[PDB]
Write a protein that binds this ligand. Sequence first.
Ligand SMILES: *Cc1c(COP(=O)(O)O)cnc(C)c1O
Ligand SMILES: *Cc1c(COP(=O)(O)O)cnc(C)c1O
Lengths: 390, 390
Amino acid sequence: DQAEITALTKRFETPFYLYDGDFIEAHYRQLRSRTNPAIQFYLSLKANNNIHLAKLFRQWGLGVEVASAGELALARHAGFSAENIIFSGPGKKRSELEIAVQSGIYCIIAESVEELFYIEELAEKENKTARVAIRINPDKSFTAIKMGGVPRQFGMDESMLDAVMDAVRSLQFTKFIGIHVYTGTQNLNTDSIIESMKYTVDLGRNIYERYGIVCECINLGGGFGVPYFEKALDIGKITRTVSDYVQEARDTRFPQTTFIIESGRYLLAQAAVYVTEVLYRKASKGEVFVIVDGGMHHHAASPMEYIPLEKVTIAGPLCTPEDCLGKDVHVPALYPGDLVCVLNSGAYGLSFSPVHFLGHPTPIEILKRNGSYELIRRKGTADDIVATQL
Amino acid sequence: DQAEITALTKRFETPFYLYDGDFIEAHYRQLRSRTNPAIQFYLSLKANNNIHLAKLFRQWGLGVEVASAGELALARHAGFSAENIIFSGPGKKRSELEIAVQSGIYCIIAESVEELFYIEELAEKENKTARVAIRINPDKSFTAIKMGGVPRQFGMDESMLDAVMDAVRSLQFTKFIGIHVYTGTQNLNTDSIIESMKYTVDLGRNIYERYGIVCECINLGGGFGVPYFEKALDIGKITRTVSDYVQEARDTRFPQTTFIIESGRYLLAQAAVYVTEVLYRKASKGEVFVIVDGGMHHHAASPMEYIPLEKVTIAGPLCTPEDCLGKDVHVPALYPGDLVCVLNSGAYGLSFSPVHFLGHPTPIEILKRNGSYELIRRKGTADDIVATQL
Ligand SMILES: *Cc1c(COP(=O)(O)O)cnc(C)c1O
Ligand SMILES: *Cc1c(COP(=O)(O)O)cnc(C)c1O
């Protein structure tokens, strides 16, 4: 609603992120309703580090997937219980593993045998039983030319499962809880997702057949993409097919197994708009440039809507040609005071950007819900920048 | 010195930035000695926002070029006097212009006629005389196909000088102090720099001939690049030729004019190394991956040195394939504990990166000088992340 947005800029200084909390909830509940109850959704915190948004998901029953001790802290700030937190990452420091073990979370998802040994040492030191899952890099490709999967820095190749399981079994203070497969972000190929998830459920079966172990948790990953430029995923097909496959596993060998589908982008991308005001308008060498008050330092990832036709380039306030929101775009003439709205800015936005580049204040974040507006992140200050320097 | 670096990792937690302050000073003094004294060097703060490093340049007599009210604050923290601060930028908010006018800095470098009018309004409100310079986008190309310059969001086309000067003259509380030309960063073409600078000095002459005004300040910009992959600029030729050209102007129409050469990258790039420790080593689909504890969140821009041959990919600790320091690089086998050093990391490093992406602590920065080591930026904390959220 342009009228709503315009009215908001009178009370909140641009540039800012505006989140539609009503949409976030409806969008999530629609996904939840179509998915087998044995599958629990986990919010990927790296997609958006705002604890106020994370709290909403916590209240709805989602778990949270963190990738650092820092995110673990944010997750606790958001109220996620330890039993609903999993720790992923290819380069966890021992200090991070230490805090994770001390926190007694659902599980640390190990990505190397050496990591498993570190966890065991820490479990012994802390006199605790550390829960671990293993991230597997499938030896299968889900357009791909070569068979056998892709070389990745993440997890451990499926072919190394024997070595991995031998290690986990030898670590007396560690308990194996399951597996995790995540093939990448912004996946817009419906069948590739279904195939990967079914493959992961099958890996669970292989583990029982080869080791007699029943995975307590099978994390199917996800990487559900959202169209930015592109067709949307057939969420109905994914949820229906995977739910049926999971139920079959549930009705046989995995009656008490928790299945997880992780999501960052799909849950939040379309729920926010980045609102920026046009500051200046100029012509240069036959072209027209419109300079707005927001940019790369707030939304590096950067559809757009304009609030009051020509070829124009929309640039941010930074001193670099890279701060371009739109090059040679055709839109009605924009003038100082007009608002440029960047759509689908709810994921990989603020925290994905070089917030301190050129010293501009970080943007305000607003959450709209139940007919009200809540400030969920204050405007940054110069002191926020020098904090680590003084 | 590998021995030095190794010893430092015992006292300082990796990943961290290490700056050779002895080099910074020697490097600067060599540049200074070869340059006409009528030319003053200005540090571009956006290249590195550490006030402790900026202070060194302030002590040596350099001015500072800021691009936001935030950087203006940092400049004052570093001790730069108002008369040695200039404010650049294509999208300055009125609030930024207000603080700039209230600070009485050497000059605000305007990039539009509308900006000039805003400055005048503020000068009137604050009962002050605002000093302004104008950023000109030359109608000349300095390999380029088309003549006449390039369309840019920065400054005002040279062809609009009449309109610009008519505006400045009509603003009674504003004093015109000069011009500024900056063609871009990482310029490794020696002659293009010399040509641009001479062209800028000539613009000063044109302004006197057409308006009878003598520029108090002519900012030649710079954009001196440094080789990362490439041949180094012939600094000797640039300093000699431009110095002679400036002296000629000095001996005729511009006897008391301050000439400025700005630099960010050239002054700091080669003075720092980003030190990261190898955490894990693994093989995946026939390839070898080495995971280090530093990455994109600290040095997004990313030569490298290794401290104890194969084809290997060096990846950071982030949960994204984009966190790659080196792909398919040939280097002696790296193992956990080894150190990977990223060279020429002194400019566009930390503040140019998405520091809060995935919640890892910002890195420590160390300054080596006169045989000692000084901590110039403490390790980040989870509280630094939630500050704006609570
Ligand atoms: C980033 C990440 C996610 C979330 O991905 P989206 O594409 O945002 O849904 C899930 N799992 C892991 C292991 C991740 O690193
Ligand atoms: C970034 C910038 C500089 C510094 O550029 P370097 O390439 O780092 O020397 C100088 N002047 C302006 C106007 C800038 O925006």
